[PDB]
Design a binder for this molecule. Structure first.
Ligand SMILES: COc1cccc(-c2cnc(N)c(N3CCC(C(=O)O)CC3)n2)c1
Ligand SMILES: [Cl-]
Ligand SMILES: [Cl-]
Ligand SMILES: [Cl-]
Ligand SMILES: [Cl-]
Length: 243
């Protein structure tokens, strides 16, 4: 549990995220670097609190956080977590736009199934966007992190709010653009409150279109619950995580 136990391979993004290798057994991991040198005792206490709660989230569809490492010489805290070799979903959407190629329905069903189960676990314990959703090396989808395109009408003015955000994310995976677009937040808010959007492309089934649309209902109480989503006939065993 010291930084010297690991070698940095390279920087993933900029605190700063780095792919690292554990020296003892060669295991590939990543860590996030948090410089706490500019923080008050009160801000460091809330940091330690947040980090200890991260450690108890064990679920196949939530990024796994293993360890935390302190380096007082640099006032740097390192959060060691699993490595998701597939990167984030935002980059998958970007790729699709550039290649002018829509994503497979099977892929969208996997994201839906696995993110719905991550949310179910989050709700049971008590920010859904493509940049916070990660892919591993075997088609598994994991929620991480922890212009407001995905802002729900009610949050504009609740576990059903998360359903709205998943609807927006799944819609963007299919259309390669969010359901509501605009140049300012006030214009965005107008579009959102009206609750109209284009059908996802026709290569996607009426059944997939229907459930996404339901998640985007203006009335939180008409959006399907996590349990109602998972009962959908589209969602099969192979859409779930597999080790
Ligand atoms: C090029 O490969 C990439 C691209 C983008 C992200 C990643 C990646 C891989 N594994 C991770 N555990 C990871 N993180 C997911 C969790 C994030 C968080 O808790 O702040 C930090 C970044 N990102 C890899
Ligand atoms: Cl898994
Ligand atoms: Cl296209
Ligand atoms: Cl269309
Ligand atoms: Cl199969």
């Amino acid at each position: 549990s010291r930084a010297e136990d690991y070698e940095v391979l390279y920087t993933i993004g900029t605190g700063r995220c780095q792919k690292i290798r554990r020296k003892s057994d060669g295991k590939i991991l990543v860590w996030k670097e948090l410089d706490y040198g500019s923080m008050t005792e009160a801000e460091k206490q809330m940091l330690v609190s947040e980090v200890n709660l991260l450690r108890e989230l064990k679920h196949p569809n939530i990024v796994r956080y293993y360890d935390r490492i302190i380096d007082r010489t640099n006032t740097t805290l390192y959060i060691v977590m699993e490595y998701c070799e597939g990167g984030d979903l935002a980059s998958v959407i970007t790729k699709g736009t550039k290649e002018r190629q829509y994503l497979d329905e099977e892929f969208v069903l996997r994201v839906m199934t696995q993110l719905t189960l991550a949310l179910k676990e989050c709700h049971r314990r008590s920010d859904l966007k493509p940049a916070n959703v990660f892919l591993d090396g075997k088609q598994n989808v994991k929620l991480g992190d922890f212009t407001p395109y995905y802002m729900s009408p009610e949050q504009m003015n609740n576990e059903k709010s998360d359903i709205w955000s998943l609807g927006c994310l799944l819609y963007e995976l299919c259309a390669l653009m969010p359901p509501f677009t605009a140049f300012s937040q006030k214009e965005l808010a107008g579009k959102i409150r009206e609750g109209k959007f284009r059908r996802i492309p026709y290569r996607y089934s009426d059944e997939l279109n229907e459930i996404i649309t339901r998640m985007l209902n203006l009335k939180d109480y008409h959006r399907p619950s996590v349990e109602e989503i998972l009962e959908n006939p589209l969602i099969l065993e192979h859409h779930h995580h597999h080790h």
